[PDB]
Amino acid sequence: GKSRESKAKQSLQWEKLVKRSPALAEVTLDAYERTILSSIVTPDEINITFQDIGGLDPLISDLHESVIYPLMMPEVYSNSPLLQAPSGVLLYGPPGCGKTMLAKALAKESGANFISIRMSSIMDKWYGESNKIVDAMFSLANKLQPCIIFIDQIDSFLRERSSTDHEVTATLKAEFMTLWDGLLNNGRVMIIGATNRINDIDDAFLRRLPKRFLVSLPGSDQRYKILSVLLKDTKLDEDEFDLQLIADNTKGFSGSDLKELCREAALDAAKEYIKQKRQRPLKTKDFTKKLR
Amino acid sequence: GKSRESKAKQSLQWEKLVKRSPALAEVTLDAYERTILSSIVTPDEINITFQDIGGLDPLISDLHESVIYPLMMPEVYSNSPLLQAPSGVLLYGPPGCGKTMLAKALAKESGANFISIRMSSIMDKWYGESNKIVDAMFSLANKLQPCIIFIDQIDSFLRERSSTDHEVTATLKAEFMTLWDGLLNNGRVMIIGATNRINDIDDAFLRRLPKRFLVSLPGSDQRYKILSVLLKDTKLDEDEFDLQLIADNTKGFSGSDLKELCREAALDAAKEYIKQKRQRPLKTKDFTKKLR
Amino acid sequence: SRESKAKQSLQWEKLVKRSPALAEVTLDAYERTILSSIVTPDEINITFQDIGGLDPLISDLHESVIYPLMMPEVYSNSPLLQAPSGVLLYGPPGCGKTMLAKALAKESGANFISIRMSSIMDKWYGESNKIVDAMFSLANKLQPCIIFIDQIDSFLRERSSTDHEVTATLKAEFMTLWDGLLNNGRVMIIGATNRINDIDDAFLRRLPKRFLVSLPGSDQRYKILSVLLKDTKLDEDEFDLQLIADNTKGFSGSDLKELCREAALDAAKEYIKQKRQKIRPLKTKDFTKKLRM
Amino acid sequence: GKSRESKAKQSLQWEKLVKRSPALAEVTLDAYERTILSSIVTPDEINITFQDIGGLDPLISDLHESVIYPLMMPEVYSNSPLLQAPSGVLLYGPPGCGKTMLAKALAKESGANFISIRMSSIMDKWYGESNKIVDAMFSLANKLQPCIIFIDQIDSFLRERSSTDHEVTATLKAEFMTLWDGLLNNGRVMIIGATNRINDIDDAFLRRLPKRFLVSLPGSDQRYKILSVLLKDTKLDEDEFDLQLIADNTKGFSGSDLKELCREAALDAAKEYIKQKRQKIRPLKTKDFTKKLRM
Amino acid sequence: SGKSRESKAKQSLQWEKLVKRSPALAEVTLDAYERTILSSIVTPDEINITFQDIGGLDPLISDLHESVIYPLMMPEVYSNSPLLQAPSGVLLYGPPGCGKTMLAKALAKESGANFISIRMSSIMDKWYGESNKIVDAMFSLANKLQPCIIFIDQIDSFLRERSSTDHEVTATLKAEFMTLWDGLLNNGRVMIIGATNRINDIDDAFLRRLPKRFLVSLPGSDQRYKILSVLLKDTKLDEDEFDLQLIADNTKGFSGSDLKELCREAALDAAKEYIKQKRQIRPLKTKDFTKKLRM
Amino acid sequence: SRESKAKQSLQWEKLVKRSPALAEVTLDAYERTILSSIVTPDEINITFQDIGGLDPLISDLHESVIYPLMMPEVYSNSPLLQAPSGVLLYGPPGCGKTMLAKALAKESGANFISIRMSSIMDKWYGESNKIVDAMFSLANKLQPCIIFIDQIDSFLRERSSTDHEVTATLKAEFMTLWDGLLNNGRVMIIGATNRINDIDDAFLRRLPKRFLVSLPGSDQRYKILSVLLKDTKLDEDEFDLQLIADNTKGFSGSDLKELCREAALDAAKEYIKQKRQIRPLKTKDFTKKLRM
Numbered sequence A, B: 001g002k003s004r005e006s007k008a009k010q011s012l013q014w015e016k017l018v019k020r021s022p023a024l025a026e027v028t029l030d031a032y033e034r035t036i037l038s039s040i041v042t043p044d045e046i047n048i049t050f051q052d053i054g055g056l057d058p059l060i061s062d063l064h065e066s067v068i069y070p071l072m073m074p075e076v077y078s079n080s081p082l083l084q085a086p087s088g089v090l091l092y093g094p095p096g097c098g099k100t101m102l103a104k105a106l107a108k109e110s111g112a113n114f115i116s117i118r119m120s121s122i123m124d125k126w127y128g129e130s131n132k133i134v135d136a137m138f139s140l141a142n143k144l145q146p147c148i149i150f151i152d153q154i155d156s157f158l159r160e161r162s163s164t165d166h167e168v169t170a171t172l173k174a175e176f177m178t179l180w181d182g183l184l185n186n187g188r189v190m191i192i193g194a195t196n197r198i199n200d201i202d203d204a205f206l207r208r209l210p211k212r213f214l215v216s217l218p219g220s221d222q223r224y225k226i227l228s229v230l231l232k233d234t235k236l237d238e239d240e241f242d243l244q245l246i247a248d249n250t251k252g253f254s255g256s257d258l259k260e261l262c263r264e265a266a267l268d269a270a271k272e273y274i275k276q277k278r279q280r281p282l283k284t285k286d287f288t289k290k291l292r
Numbered sequence C: 001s002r003e004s005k006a007k008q009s010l011q012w013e014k015l016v017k018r019s020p021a022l023a024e025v026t027l028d029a030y031e032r033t034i035l036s037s038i039v040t041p042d043e044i045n046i047t048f049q050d051i052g053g054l055d056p057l058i059s060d061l062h063e064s065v066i067y068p069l070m071m072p073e074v075y076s077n078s079p080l081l082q083a084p085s086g087v088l089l090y091g092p093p094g095c096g097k098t099m100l101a102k103a104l105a106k107e108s109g110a111n112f113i114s115i116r117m118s119s120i121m122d123k124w125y126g127e128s129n130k131i132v133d134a135m136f137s138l139a140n141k142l143q144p145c146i147i148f149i150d151q152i153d154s155f156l157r158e159r160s161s162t163d164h165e166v167t168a169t170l171k172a173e174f175m176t177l178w179d180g181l182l183n184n185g186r187v188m189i190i191g192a193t194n195r196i197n198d199i200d201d202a203f204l205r206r207l208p209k210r211f212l213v214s215l216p217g218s219d220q221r222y223k224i225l226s227v228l229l230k231d232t233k234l235d236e237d238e239f240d241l242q243l244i245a246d247n248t249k250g251f252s253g254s255d256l257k258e259l260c261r262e263a264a265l266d267a268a269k270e271y272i273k274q275k276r277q278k279i280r281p282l283k284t285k286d287f288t289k290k291l292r293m
Numbered sequence D: 001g002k003s004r005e006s007k008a009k010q011s012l013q014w015e016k017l018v019k020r021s022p023a024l025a026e027v028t029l030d031a032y033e034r035t036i037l038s039s040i041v042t043p044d045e046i047n048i049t050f051q052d053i054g055g056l057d058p059l060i061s062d063l064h065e066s067v068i069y070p071l072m073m074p075e076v077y078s079n080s081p082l083l084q085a086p087s088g089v090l091l092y093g094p095p096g097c098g099k100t101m102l103a104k105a106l107a108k109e110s111g112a113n114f115i116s117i118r119m120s121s122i123m124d125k126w127y128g129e130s131n132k133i134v135d136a137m138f139s140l141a142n143k144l145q146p147c148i149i150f151i152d153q154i155d156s157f158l159r160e161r162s163s164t165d166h167e168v169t170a171t172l173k174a175e176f177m178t179l180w181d182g183l184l185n186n187g188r189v190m191i192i193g194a195t196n197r198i199n200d201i202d203d204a205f206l207r208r209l210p211k212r213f214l215v216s217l218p219g220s221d222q223r224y225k226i227l228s229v230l231l232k233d234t235k236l237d238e239d240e241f242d243l244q245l246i247a248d249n250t251k252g253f254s255g256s257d258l259k260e261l262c263r264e265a266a267l268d269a270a271k272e273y274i275k276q277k278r279q280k281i282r283p284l285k286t287k288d289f290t291k292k293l294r295m
Numbered sequence E: 001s002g003k004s005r006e007s008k009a010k011q012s013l014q015w016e017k018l019v020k021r022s023p024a025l026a027e028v029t030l031d032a033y034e035r036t037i038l039s040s041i042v043t044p045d046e047i048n049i050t051f052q053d054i055g056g057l058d059p060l061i062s063d064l065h066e067s068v069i070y071p072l073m074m075p076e077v078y079s080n081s082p083l084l085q086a087p088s089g090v091l092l093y094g095p096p097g098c099g100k101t102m103l104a105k106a107l108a109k110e111s112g113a114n115f116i117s118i119r120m121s122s123i124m125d126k127w128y129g130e131s132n133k134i135v136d137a138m139f140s141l142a143n144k145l146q147p148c149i150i151f152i153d154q155i156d157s158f159l160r161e162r163s164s165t166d167h168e169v170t171a172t173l174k175a176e177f178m179t180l181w182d183g184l185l186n187n188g189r190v191m192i193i194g195a196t197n198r199i200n201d202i203d204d205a206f207l208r209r210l211p212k213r214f215l216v217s218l219p220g221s222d223q224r225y226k227i228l229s230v231l232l233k234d235t236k237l238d239e240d241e242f243d244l245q246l247i248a249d250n251t252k253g254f255s256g257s258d259l260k261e262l263c264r265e266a267a268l269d270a271a272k273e274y275i276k277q278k279r280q281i282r283p284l285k286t287k288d289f290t291k292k293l294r295m
Numbered sequence F: 001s002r003e004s005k006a007k008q009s010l011q012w013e014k015l016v017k018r019s020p021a022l023a024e025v026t027l028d029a030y031e032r033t034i035l036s037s038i039v040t041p042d043e044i045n046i047t048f049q050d051i052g053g054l055d056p057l058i059s060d061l062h063e064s065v066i067y068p069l070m071m072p073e074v075y076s077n078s079p080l081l082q083a084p085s086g087v088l089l090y091g092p093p094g095c096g097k098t099m100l101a102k103a104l105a106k107e108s109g110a111n112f113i114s115i116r117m118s119s120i121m122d123k124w125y126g127e128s129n130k131i132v133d134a135m136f137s138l139a140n141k142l143q144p145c146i147i148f149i150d151q152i153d154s155f156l157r158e159r160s161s162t163d164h165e166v167t168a169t170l171k172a173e174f175m176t177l178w179d180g181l182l183n184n185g186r187v188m189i190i191g192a193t194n195r196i197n198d199i200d201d202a203f204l205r206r207l208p209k210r211f212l213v214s215l216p217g218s219d220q221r222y223k224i225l226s227v228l229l230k231d232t233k234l235d236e237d238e239f240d241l242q243l244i245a246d247n248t249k250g251f252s253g254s255d256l257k258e259l260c261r262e263a264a265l266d267a268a269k270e271y272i273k274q275k276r277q278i279r280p281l282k283t284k285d286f287t288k289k290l291r292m
């Protein structure tokens, strides 16, 4: 971290990481390892928990029973070597499905050390430093034993390797595959991404993500569930309000669609509250006015 | 390089190598040689042996009798000047079929001093350091005479040279090409590489890897073999389990996909046991349920 | 590195024993650094007779390169008969450029500087340039000399504005000493490359003699297979090398060497297993089964 | 000497050392040994005690039992020869975490003779004078049998040797390695060093510092203890003031940062009192500390 | 080290100024290197800049006063709490030309502390170990002249982030500076004050030693108005045509030095006729500055 | 210095006690201040059997150094068996080189001159050359003599124009005096360096015999732990030394001494607390202090 504020952020992240577990006090880091630590996200920083995300009850339960307990509880799962947590985890679906919120909840509830690295922080201007950054990132995730590495926009980073791509990026991707699944066995390291398209991911990179969570468009019951959890603690009508009519009228709708519709429905009456304040339950009419 | 932890790791690996071969104690190493010494994998670090490999028995036997025995038994093969070890070995194939585990078994059981090198330790930002590091790698391999230098993801390291290549990468590849096969002949040093796109490798580098092993997608009997060696030391149903149906129904399944399928079957089979422990024999239904 | 200094002393002693006139020659520090890369004929295991399929190329290389350089009294009558200032061995990979390089290091008798870019490069400022200058000065001091740069398409790559300042200064210094105001003695630069087009034009000019080590023909491949299978037991009746040479279309010398090694291993696997507890004669089925045919 | 203040300080330090140890009056010193004696630090000069350090009580106790007591009392540990004091001690860690506070506590509370030699008194422009200075430093430490040679910022003095190093520096480092752990066995001399860049120290010098104390950035409980120690003999509010929150949100703050925060908090608390006095002190509050603090 | 007759005379003159400034300073004596440092001191007579000559930094000037100057110069007022003492170091960092050396000059003249404005050429020396002795004598002299502020202009170069590639004298010099700045021996009323543009260039251990940090940022609209009003003092201005407010709005992104140059160009263009008459004054107007301003 | 003169008289008296025929030898003032820095056997408390893990090196050092220097008649039959004029106990730090020097000082019986560079360099011009000349003259006069220069790498560093003129003429004088030492008297210069490469090659070739004291092996570390833990009470069953030896990867002799010291302190801290108002040493006390 060249910047002083980056160094301060690194110190804050390291102090919080030591606070979460004192077993990291004796662990000594490298310079690029501290640079990777700069992006480490702590559970207190994340606001979204697994209780916040709804409608994906089969997917949330699958995520729990196949990731959280296999990784954080090796004592329980140590009966066989096949019961370990997988090398990678994939989340794929259409845009606007709240996969980033799923990653936030997967960071928080688990309490696993989380690195939310990006393509920009990995690439460095000097020659050969992107590979060293990737190596120190994997070394840090090995040092922080119950750690999850998260990459958002994984389709760009795990993009298929061709002959027309930049040599720095191809070398970086090959180094990433070497450290991800190579001779040197990783610790309890799980790489996690959210992609709009699964075809963009390389087949070798698709191999390193053996479990894929289809964050599919919610079904009618699941649309109702997400409408309920994204209208929580919203001052609405007790008698007139009916979520099922909105769920039936919203066919082929994503989470972002319902989120923006609820946002507009709240704002149009917040305006009237401001108007009265210058000198509060809603109704169906706001929701169904948008519906046609 | 000059880091305290890296120096301790280099001393540990050198002590392990001296323990493996008492004759190695009297040899001397340069500073760059000590630097590349940190990339050496000792047999104890690898948890995968040759017998953990299934479905590649013809490949295992051919690789032994054509790669390991000519290299590690030179007195036996010294009867003819055409029985030496190949100057290079390429393990290429579709992802999952086990090239990395081939290299793991070679690191554990061949008895050769292994050098698992990634690109990050090779590339250096300073001018002329990467070429000296490659020269030191080859000199160290020559000094530890039955050595193996393994480059996972060798396609990016040995890509087809172009005018658009970075100068340091191009000079790096040319220096590697020179030391690999030049006037100053190497000892019993062999470069083993792993890749998926064999055509991505340079033609003059594919020449230096003559003994190429096509680790292709396993067949039905092969897939039965990986399913059997994956499900060892695990409780199975005596009558209900029918692994032949699982092997036949896993159409187009790589080794890693097979491992993930086995792990998922074990998880849904032992969910109840894990729930009981937090406060189940495997059957055909567990495997076929995750199978599609 | 003490190994480097010991190597320099050993090669200097070898060159002094080879040429008594070299004893009184004094060298600078960077000259000794280059002297670390001197290749003596004792380090090369291969003579010119082991290169087969290039006999016209070998003879022409001799008459145009080795004889005009090693014996200047024979060619001194006419000034046009001077040995070339550079030689390029370009072609497809595996056809035998380093074969001729090792043979020139062994049998020509010229002092050999098989330099690599690891020795030429230096992290400190103004050190790579002085290393190249001392390389040329040392080659001038060891008056019949051959400087070899394997994979020369990288050292002498086409110059661009994106090139590093130290490497641009390096290539310019190489150009200046290669053919500048102060002409060299009997110093000839020899290079090998897979990509001749990547070499700079101002360097391709400085390599006037160009040997195209092309892909071997049928008779050439027969010569390579006869050379590689020398001192190896062959079947008098079954084994016929002409069929094998004809069948191996588009095979370089390295591919033929790998075919010979694999065939010998397949033939002698039973001998190997007996040793684990004579060599079987090599047959045409043994070679042809491995080959695609 | 070559300076009136230097000679006066030499005489004063020698008198203090003679008063501390009556048997030291019979010991004669060389001119270079007197120049080293000019750098003797007595406890009366140091104002920090071990009680003035907070958040390092496990480290303070470990340092005591492994360094101070094995050196100060050898009769308790003399039942076995393996209980002797370490030859060197390295206090390494990020800056501002209390390494020189521990050094001051070692100077005052431990009771060992303390030399806080600086790199100016060691280096000399002449030939061989620096090496004679180092040799006399080690001889003086041996004469003052329970000595501690403290060298603040030992990373620069004991940096990795190289050909680029001046010949006097390389000769100096070789002389230090010879006297420190070489053919002649030292007395109860311990070389205590503080640094921020442990990796800069030579490996051959690092082996001569076998006891290593890592003074890292303070934790939340450590920050609370440090703030409680720093805010002693102050007027604090009985109900408004609460140190726990303030220790909580000062993430990544070293001891120096906490001292600065307390300093500016005291200044802005008393600002009205100074305004009155220039023409009592307001008790400190949590809003006062968190106003200067950036949260 | 190296001394000259003119340098000796300058040191003698500075010593006379110090003795006249404080009678108790006459009884102390100095070393040769202390006298060398004496040449780098600054008296209020040599400075023509007052704290009233700085515009736009009035809250920063008041904060600097209350947190820096008053605790250092009247410890009797602040002696009720030990946490009221002056900071060990103060960093004046910001974009270039914003007024850091203006603040330092006003500090040297109006605060009244013995000011040592040291430059990098007086510290470095080719001879071995002379830089460390120069720094040691600098700190000893600053302790001798008890209220003392040591100014290192462009302190980023002196206190740059240490690395293994640093010269042995540079690294030893910086380690000696860190040892004396805050080490075993507590400094007296000595404060090291440094101006810089590259705060990020400074090592973390040095930034630890400069806890009070002042950001002299680029001036705002009101700040630019105050700077222009200060610069245009004792210069005739048009009663009606001049409008400093509009000028202040249009000079966006200007530092104090840029505004000084704008005023210089405007004044020269105004007085060109007067200079033509003198070779063989018009009051300043808005168009004078506007013809140069590039809004 | 009066103390220096007292030390000189004490050393000369001890030498006269060691060799009765040595009383006749006359001294110069430079020879006296050289004599001030020599070491007698009683000052050394380290004996050859106090060094563990170096018994092959102990025997080689004996047969090539101790006997040829002490018994010249026996080994004068072949010039190869004669004592070399230069011995270099080089190796990694903390492996026993200066302990080997201490044992050579105490057990040889040869007059050991352990000089330091503080006694050789001098500010006055020409005094250092007289010091070195008197050193070699005293080595001549004390007929069995070993000039031990601890850290000879700094003395014998590569000559450069940046070095002082006095340093250059000192190195020239030392080369002049060192050459001709073969077959003229029995004087051998013993050096001990961490970094052999720092030695100037012209001075390096004056040391033909080289002893590599490398990092100890597992068996050597077991022997070192056995030697260090002598006259110390150990548990009969709970204490196994081979576990400590195998767990101390890359540990030098100094590091092993520190580990034993801290383990003994940790085990005896309860007895120390009782005394201020000994437990047998066990494997657990080592392993809690040790890192696995």
Ligand SMILES: Nc1ncnc2c1ncn2[C@@H]1O[C@H](COP(=O)(O)OP(=O)(O)OP(=O)(O)O)[C@@H](O)[C@H]1O
Residues within 6 Å of the ligand: A177, A181, A182, A203, A204, A205, A207, A208, B052, B053, B054, B055, B056, B093, B094, B095, B096, B097, B098, B099, B100, B101, B102, B195, B196, B226, B229, B230, B254, B255, B256, B257, B259
């Ligand atoms: N022959 C085999 N025997 C047993 N298990 C196998 C075999 N091949 C693959 N596997 C299983 O599949 C996984 C394959 O991982 P491996 O590291 O071999 O893939 P890879 O070679 O890195 O793939 P890629 O081509 O994407 O680089 C292993 O974890 C292993 O459990």
Ligand SMILES: Nc1ncnc2c1ncn2[C@@H]1O[C@H](COP(=O)(O)OP(=O)(O)OP(=O)(O)O)[C@@H](O)[C@H]1O
Residues within 6 Å of the ligand: B181, B182, B204, B207, C050, C051, C052, C053, C054, C091, C092, C093, C094, C095, C096, C097, C098, C099, C100, C193, C194, C224, C227, C228, C252, C253, C254, C255, C257
């Ligand atoms: N003309 C030849 N005669 C005999 N053997 C040959 C010939 N050409 C190649 N070979 C065999 O092939 C092997 C490799 O040849 P060589 O090393 O000359 O290729 P190369 O020129 O280095 O390839 P590249 O052009 O990629 O650098 C040699 O060991 C040699 O045994």
Ligand SMILES: Nc1ncnc2c1ncn2[C@@H]1O[C@H](COP(=O)(O)OP(=O)(O)OP(=O)(O)O)[C@@H](O)[C@H]1O
Residues within 6 Å of the ligand: D052, D053, D054, D055, D056, D094, D095, D096, D097, D098, D099, D100, D101, D194, D196, D226, D229, D230, D254, D255, D256, D257, D259, E182, E183, E205, E208
């Ligand atoms: N553990 C602590 N307990 C109480 N106060 C502390 C502690 N650590 C630091 N401080 C306060 O912070 C200031 C830091 O001074 P200190 O001597 O620790 O710095 P230093 O160790 O010299 O710096 P460096 O780490 O760069 O050598 C001290 O004045 C002290 O008041």
Ligand SMILES: Nc1ncnc2c1ncn2[C@@H]1O[C@H](COP(=O)(O)OP(=O)(O)OP(=O)(O)O)[C@@H](O)[C@H]1O
Residues within 6 Å of the ligand: E053, E054, E055, E056, E057, E095, E096, E097, E098, E099, E100, E101, E102, E103, E195, E196, E197, E226, E227, E230, E231, E255, E256, E257, E258, E260
């Ligand atoms: N706040 C201000 N009020 C009035 N004039 C100012 C102010 N700041 C700067 N100036 C004018 O700008 C000129 C330069 O300011 P100063 O010398 O403080 O910059 P500096 O801090 O030395 O810059 P650098 O960062 O490049 O060292 C001064 O002569 C002054 O006239």
Ligand SMILES: Nc1ncnc2c1ncn2[C@@H]1O[C@H](COP(=O)(O)OP(=O)(O)OP(=O)(O)O)[C@@H](O)[C@H]1O
Residues within 6 Å of the ligand: D177, D181, D182, D204, D207, F050, F051, F052, F053, F054, F091, F092, F093, F094, F095, F096, F097, F098, F099, F100, F192, F193, F194, F224, F227, F228, F252, F253, F254, F255, F257
């Ligand atoms: N081979 C060994 N056998 C027994 N004890 C050893 C051995 N090596 C080291 N030790 C112990 O560790 C300590 C190491 O100090 P020693 O003087 O041997 O190091 P050194 O030779 O000075 O190393 P360097 O010169 O590289 O600093 C010794 O006091 C000794 O007690």
Ligand SMILES: [Mg+2]
Residues within 6 Å of the ligand: A177, A181, A182, B099, B100, B152, B194
């Ligand atoms: Mg792979």
Ligand SMILES: [Mg+2]
Residues within 6 Å of the ligand: B181, C097, C098, C150, C192
């Ligand atoms: Mg070639």
Ligand SMILES: [Mg+2]
Residues within 6 Å of the ligand: D099, D100, D152, D153, D194, E178, E179, E182, E183
């Ligand atoms: Mg300090």
Ligand SMILES: [Mg+2]
Residues within 6 Å of the ligand: E100, E101, E153, E154, E195
């Ligand atoms: Mg300035």
Ligand SMILES: [Mg+2]
Residues within 6 Å of the ligand: D181, D182, D183, F097, F098, F099, F150, F192
């Ligand atoms: Mg030693």
